[PDB]
Coordinates of N, CA and C (backbone and C1' of nucleotides) in Angstrom, one line a residue:
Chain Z
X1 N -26.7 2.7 -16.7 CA -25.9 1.6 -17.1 C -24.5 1.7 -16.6
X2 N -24.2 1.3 -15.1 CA -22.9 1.0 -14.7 C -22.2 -0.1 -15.1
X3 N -21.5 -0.1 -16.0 CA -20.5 -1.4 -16.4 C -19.4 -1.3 -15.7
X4 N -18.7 -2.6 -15.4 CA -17.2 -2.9 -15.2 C -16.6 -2.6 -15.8
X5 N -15.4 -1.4 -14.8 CA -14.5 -0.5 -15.1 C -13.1 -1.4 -14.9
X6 N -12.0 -1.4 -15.9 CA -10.5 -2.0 -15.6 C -9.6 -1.3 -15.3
X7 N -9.8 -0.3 -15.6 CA -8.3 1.0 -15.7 C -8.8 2.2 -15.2
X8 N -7.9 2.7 -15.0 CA -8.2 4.5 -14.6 C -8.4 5.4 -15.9
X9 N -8.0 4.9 -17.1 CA -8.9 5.5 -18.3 C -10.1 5.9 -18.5
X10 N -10.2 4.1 -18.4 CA -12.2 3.8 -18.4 C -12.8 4.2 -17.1
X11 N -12.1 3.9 -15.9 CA -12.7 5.0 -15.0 C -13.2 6.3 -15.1
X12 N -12.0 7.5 -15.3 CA -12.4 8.6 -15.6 C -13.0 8.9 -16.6
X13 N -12.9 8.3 -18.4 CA -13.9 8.3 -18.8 C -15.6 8.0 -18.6
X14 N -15.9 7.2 -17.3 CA -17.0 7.4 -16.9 C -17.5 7.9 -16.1
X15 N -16.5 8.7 -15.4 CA -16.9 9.4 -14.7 C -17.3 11.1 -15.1
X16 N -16.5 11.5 -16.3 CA -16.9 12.6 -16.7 C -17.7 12.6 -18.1
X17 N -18.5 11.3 -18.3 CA -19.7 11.5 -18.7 C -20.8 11.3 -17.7
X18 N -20.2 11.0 -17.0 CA -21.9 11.2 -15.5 C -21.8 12.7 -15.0
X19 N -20.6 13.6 -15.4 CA -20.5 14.9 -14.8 C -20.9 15.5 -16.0
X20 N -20.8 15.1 -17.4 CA -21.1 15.8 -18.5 C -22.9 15.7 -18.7
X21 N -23.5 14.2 -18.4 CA -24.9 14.0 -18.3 C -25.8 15.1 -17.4
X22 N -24.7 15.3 -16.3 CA -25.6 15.8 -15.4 C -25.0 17.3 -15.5
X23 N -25.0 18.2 -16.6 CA -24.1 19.3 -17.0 C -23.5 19.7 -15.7
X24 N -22.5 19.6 -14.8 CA -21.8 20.2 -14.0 C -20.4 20.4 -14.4
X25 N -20.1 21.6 -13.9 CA -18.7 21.7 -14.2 C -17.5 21.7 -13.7
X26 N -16.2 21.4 -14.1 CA -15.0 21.1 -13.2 C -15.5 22.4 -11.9
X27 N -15.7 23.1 -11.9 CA -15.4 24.0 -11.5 C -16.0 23.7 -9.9
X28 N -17.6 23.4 -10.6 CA -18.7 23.6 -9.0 C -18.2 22.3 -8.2
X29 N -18.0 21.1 -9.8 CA -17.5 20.1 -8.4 C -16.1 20.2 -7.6
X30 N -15.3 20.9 -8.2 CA -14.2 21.2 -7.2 C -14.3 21.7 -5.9
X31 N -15.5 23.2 -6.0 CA -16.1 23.7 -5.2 C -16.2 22.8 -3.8
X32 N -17.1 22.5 -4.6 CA -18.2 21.3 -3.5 C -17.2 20.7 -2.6
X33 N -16.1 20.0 -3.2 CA -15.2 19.1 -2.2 C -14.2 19.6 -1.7
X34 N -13.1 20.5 -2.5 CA -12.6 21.8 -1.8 C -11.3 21.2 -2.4
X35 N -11.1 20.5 -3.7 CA -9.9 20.7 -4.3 C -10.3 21.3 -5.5
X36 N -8.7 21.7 -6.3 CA -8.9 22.5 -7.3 C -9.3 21.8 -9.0
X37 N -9.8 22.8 -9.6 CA -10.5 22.6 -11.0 C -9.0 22.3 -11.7
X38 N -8.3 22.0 -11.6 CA -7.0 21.4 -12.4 C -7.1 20.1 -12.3
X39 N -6.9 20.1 -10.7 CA -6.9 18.8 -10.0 C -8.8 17.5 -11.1
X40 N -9.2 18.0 -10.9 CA -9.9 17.4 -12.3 C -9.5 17.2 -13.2
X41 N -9.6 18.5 -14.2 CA -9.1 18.6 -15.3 C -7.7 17.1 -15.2
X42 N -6.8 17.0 -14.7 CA -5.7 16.1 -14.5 C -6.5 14.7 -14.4
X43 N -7.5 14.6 -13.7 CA -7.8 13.3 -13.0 C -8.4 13.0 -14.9
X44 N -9.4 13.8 -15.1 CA -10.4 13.5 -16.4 C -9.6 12.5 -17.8
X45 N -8.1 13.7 -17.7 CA -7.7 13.2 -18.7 C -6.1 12.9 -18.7
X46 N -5.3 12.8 -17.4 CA -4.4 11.9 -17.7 C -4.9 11.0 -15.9
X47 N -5.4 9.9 -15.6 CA -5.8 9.6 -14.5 C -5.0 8.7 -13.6
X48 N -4.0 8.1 -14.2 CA -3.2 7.0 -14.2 C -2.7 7.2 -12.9
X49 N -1.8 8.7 -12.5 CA -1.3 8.9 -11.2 C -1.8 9.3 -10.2
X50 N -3.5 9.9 -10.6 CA -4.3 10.2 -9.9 C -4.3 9.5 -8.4
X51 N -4.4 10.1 -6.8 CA -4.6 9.7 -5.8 C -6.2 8.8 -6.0
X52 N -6.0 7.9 -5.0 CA -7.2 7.4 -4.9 C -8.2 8.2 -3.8
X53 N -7.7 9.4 -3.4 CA -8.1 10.5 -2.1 C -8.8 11.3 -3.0
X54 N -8.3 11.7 -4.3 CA -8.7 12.5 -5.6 C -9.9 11.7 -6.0
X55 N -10.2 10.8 -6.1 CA -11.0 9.7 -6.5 C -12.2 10.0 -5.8
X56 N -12.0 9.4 -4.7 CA -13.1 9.3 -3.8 C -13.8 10.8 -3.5
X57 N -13.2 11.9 -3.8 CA -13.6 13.1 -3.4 C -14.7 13.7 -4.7
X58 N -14.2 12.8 -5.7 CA -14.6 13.0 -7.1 C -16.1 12.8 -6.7
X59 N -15.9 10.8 -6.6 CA -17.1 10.3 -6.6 C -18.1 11.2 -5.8
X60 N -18.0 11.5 -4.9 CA -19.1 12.3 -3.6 C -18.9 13.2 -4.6
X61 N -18.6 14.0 -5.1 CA -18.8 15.2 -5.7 C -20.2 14.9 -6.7
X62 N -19.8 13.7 -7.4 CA -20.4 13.3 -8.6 C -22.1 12.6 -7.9
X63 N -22.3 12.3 -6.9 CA -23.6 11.8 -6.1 C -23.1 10.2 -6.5
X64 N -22.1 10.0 -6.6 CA -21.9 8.4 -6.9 C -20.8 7.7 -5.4
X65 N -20.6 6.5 -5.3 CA -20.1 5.8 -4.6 C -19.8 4.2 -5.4
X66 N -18.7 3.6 -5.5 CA -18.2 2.2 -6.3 C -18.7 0.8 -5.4
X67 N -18.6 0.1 -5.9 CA -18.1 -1.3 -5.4 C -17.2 -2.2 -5.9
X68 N -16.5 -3.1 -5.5 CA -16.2 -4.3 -6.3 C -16.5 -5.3 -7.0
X69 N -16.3 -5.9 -7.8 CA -17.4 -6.9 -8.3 C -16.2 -8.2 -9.4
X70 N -16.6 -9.5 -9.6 CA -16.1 -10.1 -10.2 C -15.2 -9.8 -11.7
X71 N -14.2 -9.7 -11.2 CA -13.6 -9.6 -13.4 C -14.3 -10.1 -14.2
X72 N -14.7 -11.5 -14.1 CA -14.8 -12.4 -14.8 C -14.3 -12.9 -16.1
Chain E
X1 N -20.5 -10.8 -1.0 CA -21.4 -9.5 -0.1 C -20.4 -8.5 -0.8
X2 N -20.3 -7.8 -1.6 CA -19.7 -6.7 -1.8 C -20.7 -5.7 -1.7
X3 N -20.0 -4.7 -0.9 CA -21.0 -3.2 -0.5 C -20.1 -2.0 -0.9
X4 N -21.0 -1.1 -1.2 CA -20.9 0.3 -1.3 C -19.9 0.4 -0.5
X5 N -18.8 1.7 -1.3 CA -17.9 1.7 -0.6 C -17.3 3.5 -1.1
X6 N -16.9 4.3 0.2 CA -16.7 5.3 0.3 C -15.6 6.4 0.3
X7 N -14.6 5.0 0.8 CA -12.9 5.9 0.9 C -12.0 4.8 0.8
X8 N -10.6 5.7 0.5 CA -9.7 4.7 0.2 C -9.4 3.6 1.4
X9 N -9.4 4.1 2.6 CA -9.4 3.1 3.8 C -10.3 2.4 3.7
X10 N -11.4 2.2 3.5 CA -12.4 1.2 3.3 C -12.4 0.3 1.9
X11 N -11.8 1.3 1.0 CA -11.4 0.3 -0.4 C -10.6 -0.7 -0.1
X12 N -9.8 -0.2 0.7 CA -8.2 -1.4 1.0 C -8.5 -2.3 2.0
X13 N -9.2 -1.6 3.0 CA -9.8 -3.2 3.9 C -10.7 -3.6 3.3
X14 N -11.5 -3.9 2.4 CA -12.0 -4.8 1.3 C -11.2 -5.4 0.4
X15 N -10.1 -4.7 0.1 CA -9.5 -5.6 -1.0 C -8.5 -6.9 -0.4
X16 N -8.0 -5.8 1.0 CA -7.2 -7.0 2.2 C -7.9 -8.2 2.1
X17 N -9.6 -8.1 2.5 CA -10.0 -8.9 3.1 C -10.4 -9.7 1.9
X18 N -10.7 -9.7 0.4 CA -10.4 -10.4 -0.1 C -9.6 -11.7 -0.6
X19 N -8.0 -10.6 -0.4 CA -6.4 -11.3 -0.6 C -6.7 -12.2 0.6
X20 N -6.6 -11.8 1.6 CA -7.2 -12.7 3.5 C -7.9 -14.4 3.0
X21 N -9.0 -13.9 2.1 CA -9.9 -15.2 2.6 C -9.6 -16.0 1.0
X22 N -9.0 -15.5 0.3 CA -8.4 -16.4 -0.8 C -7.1 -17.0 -0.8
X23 N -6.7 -16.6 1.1 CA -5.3 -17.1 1.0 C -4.1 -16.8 0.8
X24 N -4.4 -15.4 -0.3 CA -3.1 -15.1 -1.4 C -2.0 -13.8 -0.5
X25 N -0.9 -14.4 -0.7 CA 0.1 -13.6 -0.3 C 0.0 -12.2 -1.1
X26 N 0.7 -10.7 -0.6 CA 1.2 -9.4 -1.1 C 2.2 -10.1 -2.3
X27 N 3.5 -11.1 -2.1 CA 4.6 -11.5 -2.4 C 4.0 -12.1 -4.2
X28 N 2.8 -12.7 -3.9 CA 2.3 -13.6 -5.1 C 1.2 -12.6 -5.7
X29 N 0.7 -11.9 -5.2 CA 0.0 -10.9 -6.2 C 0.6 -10.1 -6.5
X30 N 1.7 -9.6 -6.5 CA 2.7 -8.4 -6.7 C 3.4 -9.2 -7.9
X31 N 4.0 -10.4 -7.9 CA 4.8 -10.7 -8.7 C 3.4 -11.0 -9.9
X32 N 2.6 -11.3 -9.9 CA 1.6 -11.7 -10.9 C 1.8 -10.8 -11.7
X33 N 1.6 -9.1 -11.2 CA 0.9 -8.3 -12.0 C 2.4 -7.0 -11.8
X34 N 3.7 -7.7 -11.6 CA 4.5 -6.8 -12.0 C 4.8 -5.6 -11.2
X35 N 4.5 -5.4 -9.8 CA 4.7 -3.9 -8.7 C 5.7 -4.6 -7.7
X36 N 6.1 -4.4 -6.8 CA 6.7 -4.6 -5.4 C 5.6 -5.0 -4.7
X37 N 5.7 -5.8 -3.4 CA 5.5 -6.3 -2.6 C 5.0 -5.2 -1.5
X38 N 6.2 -4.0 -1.5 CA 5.6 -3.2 -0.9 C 5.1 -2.3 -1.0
X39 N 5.1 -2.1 -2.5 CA 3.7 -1.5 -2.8 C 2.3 -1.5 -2.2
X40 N 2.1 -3.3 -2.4 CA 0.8 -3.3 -2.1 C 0.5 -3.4 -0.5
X41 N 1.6 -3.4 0.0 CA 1.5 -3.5 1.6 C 1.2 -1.8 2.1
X42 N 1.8 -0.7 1.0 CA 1.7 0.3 1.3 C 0.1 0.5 0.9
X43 N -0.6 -0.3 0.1 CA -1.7 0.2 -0.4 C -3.1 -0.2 0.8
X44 N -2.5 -1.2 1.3 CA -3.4 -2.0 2.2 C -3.4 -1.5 4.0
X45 N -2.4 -0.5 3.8 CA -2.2 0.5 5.3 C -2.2 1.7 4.7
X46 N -1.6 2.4 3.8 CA -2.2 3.7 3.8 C -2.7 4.0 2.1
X47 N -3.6 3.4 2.1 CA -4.2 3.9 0.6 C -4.3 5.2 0.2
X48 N -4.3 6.5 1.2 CA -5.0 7.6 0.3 C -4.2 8.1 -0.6
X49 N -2.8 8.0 -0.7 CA -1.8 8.5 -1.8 C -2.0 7.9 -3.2
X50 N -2.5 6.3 -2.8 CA -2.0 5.7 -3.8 C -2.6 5.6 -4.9
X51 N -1.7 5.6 -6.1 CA -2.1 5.5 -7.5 C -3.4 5.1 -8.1
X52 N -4.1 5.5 -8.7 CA -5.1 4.9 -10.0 C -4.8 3.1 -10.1
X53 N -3.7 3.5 -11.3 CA -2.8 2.7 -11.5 C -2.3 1.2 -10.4
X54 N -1.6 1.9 -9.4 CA -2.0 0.5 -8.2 C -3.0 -0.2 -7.9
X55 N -3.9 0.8 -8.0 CA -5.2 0.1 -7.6 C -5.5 -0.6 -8.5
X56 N -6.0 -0.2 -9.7 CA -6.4 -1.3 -10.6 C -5.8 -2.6 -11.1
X57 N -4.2 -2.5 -10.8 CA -3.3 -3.3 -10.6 C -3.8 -4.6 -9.7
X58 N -3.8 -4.0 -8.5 CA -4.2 -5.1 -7.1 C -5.7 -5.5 -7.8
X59 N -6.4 -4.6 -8.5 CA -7.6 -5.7 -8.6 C -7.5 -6.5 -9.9
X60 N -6.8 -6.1 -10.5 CA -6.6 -7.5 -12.0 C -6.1 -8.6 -10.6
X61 N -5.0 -8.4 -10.2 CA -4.6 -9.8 -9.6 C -5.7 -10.4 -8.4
X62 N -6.3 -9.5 -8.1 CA -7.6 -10.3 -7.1 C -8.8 -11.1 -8.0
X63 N -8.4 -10.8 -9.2 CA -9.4 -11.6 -10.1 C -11.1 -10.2 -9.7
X64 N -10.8 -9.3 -9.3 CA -11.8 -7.9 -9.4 C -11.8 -7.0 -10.2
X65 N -12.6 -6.6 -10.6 CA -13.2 -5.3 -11.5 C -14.0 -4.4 -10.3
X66 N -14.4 -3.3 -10.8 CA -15.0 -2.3 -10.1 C -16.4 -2.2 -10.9
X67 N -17.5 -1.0 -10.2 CA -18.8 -0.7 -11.0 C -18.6 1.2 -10.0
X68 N -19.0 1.9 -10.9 CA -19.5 3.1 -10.2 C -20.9 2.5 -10.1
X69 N -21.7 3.1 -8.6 CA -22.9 3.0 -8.1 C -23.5 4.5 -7.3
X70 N -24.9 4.2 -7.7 CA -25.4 5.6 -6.7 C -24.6 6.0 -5.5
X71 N -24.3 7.3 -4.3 CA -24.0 7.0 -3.6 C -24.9 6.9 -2.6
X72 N -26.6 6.7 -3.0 CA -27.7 6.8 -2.0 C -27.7 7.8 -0.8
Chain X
dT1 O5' 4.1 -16.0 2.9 C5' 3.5 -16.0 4.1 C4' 3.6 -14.7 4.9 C3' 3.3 -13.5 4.0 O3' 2.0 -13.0 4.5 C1' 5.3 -13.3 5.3
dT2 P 1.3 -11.8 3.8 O5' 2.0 -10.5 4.5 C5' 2.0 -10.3 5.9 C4' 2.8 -9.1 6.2 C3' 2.7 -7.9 5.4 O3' 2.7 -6.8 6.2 C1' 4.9 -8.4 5.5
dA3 P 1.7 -5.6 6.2 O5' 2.4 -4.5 7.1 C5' 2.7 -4.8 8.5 C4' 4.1 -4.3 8.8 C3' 4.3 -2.8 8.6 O3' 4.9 -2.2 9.7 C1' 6.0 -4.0 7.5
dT4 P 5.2 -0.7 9.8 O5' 6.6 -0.5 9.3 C5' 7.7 -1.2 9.8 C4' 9.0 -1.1 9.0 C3' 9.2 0.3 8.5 O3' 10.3 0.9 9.2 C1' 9.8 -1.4 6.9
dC5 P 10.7 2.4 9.1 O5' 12.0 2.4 8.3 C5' 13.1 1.6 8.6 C4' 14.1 1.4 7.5 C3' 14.3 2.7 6.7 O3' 15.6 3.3 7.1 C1' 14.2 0.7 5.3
dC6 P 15.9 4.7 6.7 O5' 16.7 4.5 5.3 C5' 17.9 3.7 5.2 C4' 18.4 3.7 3.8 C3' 18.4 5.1 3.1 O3' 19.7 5.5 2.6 C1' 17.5 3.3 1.7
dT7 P 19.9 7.0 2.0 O5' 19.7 6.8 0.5 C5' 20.5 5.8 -0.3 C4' 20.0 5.8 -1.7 C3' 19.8 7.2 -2.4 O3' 20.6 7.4 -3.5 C1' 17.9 5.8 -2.7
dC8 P 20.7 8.8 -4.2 O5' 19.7 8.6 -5.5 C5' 19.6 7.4 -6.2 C4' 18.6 7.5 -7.3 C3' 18.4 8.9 -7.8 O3' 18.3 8.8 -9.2 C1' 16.4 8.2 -6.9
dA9 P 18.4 10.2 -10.1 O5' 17.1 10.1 -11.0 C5' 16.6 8.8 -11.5 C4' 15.2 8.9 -11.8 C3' 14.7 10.2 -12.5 O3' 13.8 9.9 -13.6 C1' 13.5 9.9 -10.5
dC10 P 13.3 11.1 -14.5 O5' 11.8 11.2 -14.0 C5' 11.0 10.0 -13.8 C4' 9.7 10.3 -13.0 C3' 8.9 11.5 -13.5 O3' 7.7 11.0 -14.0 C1' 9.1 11.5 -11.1
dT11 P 6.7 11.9 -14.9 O5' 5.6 12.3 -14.0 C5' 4.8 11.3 -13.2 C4' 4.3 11.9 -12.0 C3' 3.3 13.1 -12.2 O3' 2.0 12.6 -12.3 C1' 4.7 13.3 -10.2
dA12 P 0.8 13.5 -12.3 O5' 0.4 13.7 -10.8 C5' 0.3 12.5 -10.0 C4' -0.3 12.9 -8.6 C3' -1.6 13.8 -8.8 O3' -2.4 13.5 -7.7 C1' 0.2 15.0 -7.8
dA13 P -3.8 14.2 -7.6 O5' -3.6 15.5 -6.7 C5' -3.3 15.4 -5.3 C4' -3.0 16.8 -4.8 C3' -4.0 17.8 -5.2 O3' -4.5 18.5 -4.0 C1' -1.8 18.6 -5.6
dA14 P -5.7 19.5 -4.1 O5' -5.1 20.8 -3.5 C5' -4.6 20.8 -2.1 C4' -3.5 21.9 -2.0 C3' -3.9 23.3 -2.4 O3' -4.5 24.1 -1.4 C1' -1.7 22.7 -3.2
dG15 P -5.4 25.3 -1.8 O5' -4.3 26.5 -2.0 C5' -3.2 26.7 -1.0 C4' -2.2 27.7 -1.6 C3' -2.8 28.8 -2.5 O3' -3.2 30.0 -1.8 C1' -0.9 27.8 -3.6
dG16 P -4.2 31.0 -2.5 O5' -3.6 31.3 -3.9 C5' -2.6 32.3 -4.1 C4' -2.0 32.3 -5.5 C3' -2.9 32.8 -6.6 O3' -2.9 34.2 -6.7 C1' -1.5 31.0 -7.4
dA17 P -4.1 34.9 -7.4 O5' -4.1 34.4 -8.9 C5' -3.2 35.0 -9.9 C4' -3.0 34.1 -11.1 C3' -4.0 34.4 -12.2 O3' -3.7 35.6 -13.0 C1' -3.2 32.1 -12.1
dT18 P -4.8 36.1 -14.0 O5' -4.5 35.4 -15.3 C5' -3.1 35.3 -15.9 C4' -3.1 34.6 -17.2 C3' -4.2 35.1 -18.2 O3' -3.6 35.6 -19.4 C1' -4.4 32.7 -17.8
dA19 P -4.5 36.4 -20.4 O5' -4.9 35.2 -21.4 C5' -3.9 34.4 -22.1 C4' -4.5 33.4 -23.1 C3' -5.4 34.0 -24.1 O3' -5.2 33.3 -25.3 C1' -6.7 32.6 -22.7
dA20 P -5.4 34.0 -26.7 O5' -6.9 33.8 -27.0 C5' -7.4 32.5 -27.4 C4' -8.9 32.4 -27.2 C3' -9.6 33.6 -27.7 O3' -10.6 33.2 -28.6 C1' -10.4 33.0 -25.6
Chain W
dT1 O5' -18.6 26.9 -17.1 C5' -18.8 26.5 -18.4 C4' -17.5 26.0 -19.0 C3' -16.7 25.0 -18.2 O3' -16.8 23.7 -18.7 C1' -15.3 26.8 -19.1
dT2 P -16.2 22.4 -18.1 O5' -14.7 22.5 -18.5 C5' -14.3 22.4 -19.9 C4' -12.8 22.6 -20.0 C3' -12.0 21.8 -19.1 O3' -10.9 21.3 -19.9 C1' -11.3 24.0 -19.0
dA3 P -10.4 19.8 -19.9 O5' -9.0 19.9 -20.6 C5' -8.9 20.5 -21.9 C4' -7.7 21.4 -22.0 C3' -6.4 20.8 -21.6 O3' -5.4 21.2 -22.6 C1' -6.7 22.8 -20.4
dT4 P -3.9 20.6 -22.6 O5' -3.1 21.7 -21.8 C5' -3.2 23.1 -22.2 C4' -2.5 24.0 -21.2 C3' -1.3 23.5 -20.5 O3' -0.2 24.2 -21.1 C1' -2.7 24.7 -19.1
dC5 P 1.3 23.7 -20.8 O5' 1.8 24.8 -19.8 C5' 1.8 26.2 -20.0 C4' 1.9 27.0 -18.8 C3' 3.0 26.5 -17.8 O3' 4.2 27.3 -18.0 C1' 1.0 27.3 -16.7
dC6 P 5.6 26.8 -17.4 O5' 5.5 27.5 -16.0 C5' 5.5 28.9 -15.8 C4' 5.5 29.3 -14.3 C3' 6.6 28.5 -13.5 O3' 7.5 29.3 -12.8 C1' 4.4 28.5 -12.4
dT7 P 8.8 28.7 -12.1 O5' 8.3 28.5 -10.6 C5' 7.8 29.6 -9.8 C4' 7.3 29.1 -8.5 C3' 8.3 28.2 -7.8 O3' 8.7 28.7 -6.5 C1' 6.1 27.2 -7.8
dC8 P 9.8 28.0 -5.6 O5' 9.0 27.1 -4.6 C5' 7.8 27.6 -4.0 C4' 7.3 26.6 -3.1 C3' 8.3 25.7 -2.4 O3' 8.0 25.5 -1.1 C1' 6.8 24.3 -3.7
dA9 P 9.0 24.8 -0.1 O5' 8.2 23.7 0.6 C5' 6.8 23.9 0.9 C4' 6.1 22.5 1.0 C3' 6.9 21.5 1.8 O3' 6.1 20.7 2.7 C1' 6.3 20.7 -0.4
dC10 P 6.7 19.6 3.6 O5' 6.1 18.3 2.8 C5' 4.7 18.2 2.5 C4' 4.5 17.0 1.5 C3' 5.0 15.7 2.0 O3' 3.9 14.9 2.3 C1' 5.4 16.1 -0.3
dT11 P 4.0 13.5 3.1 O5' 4.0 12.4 2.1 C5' 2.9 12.3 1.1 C4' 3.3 11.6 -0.1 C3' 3.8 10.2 0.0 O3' 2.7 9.3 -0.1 C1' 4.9 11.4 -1.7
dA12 P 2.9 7.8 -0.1 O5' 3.0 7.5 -1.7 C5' 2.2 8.1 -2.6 C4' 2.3 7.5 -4.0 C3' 2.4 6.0 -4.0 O3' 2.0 5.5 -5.2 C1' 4.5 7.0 -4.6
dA13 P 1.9 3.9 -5.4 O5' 3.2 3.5 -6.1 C5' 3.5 4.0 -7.5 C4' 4.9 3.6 -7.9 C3' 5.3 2.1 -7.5 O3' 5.7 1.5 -8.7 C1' 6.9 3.6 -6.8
dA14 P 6.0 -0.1 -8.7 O5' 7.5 -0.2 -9.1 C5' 7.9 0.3 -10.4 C4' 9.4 0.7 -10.3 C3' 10.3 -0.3 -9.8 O3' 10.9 -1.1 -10.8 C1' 10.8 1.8 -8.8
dG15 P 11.5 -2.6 -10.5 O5' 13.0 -2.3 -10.0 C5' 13.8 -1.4 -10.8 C4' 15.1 -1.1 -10.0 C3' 15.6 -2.2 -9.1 O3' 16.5 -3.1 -9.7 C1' 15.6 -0.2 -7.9
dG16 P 16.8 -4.5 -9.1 O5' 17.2 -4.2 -7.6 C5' 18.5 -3.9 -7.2 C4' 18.6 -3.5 -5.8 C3' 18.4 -4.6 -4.7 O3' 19.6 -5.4 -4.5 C1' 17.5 -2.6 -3.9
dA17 P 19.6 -6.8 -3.9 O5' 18.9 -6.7 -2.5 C5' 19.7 -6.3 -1.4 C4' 18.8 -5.8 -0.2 C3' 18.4 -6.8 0.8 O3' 19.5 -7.3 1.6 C1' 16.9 -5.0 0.6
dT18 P 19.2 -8.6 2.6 O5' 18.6 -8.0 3.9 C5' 19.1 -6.9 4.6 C4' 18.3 -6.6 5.8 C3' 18.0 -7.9 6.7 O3' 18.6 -7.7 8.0 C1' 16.0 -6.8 6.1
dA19 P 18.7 -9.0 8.9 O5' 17.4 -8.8 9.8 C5' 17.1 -7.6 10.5 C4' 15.8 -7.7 11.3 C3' 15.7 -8.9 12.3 O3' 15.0 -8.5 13.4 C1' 14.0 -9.1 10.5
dA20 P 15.3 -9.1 14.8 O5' 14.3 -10.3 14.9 C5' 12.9 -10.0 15.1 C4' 12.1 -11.3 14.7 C3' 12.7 -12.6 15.2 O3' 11.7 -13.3 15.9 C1' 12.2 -12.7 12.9

DNA sequence: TTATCCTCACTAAAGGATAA
DNA sequence: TTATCCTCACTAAAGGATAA
């Protein structure tokens, strides 16, 4: 169930329940993409300033990829 | 046609090409939603720095929302 | 119309690391 | 395990603005 995301809140809140569902940890996904487990930790829970380079490195980490779609 | 989408460069030429074919100026979606003008000009040539926060910004005013999706 | 410029205050993210 | 800390180099974004 991917719903329409508005903010970088609700973003990273859904993004670190798809990392929590699928038990991984800041740690291996940082690994994986080759920034650091802070650099998470930061994005998870204050996201606001977060890079959108930080983002995208997330998403592939996470087996996910976005689209855009109507506000409505 | 909105598609799966991978990196910030590819986020921004989607969102360009949105603002493009609805017409709408940087000048009039910046003032809508309260950023500089060239902000979003910086976001639509070099997105990887740019904010959370921007982003979601430029997509309230494109009348867009987002979805996280598989990355297949 | 939009890429581009100046300044300033702030932050992200890298390097490094810790507690419990 | 993850929130949190230090340092440093870099940038985004705000204030202000321009050319053509």
């Amino acid at each position: 169930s991917f719903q329409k995301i508005y903010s970088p809140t609700q973003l990273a809140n859904a993004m670190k329940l798809v990392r929590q569902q699928n038990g991984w940890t800041q740690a291996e996904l940082a690994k994986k993409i080759g920034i650091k487990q802070a650099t998470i930790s930061n994005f998870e829970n204050n996201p606001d300033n977060t890079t959108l380079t930080t983002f995208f490195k997330i998403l592939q980490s996470l087996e996910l990829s976005m689209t855009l779609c109507d506000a409505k």
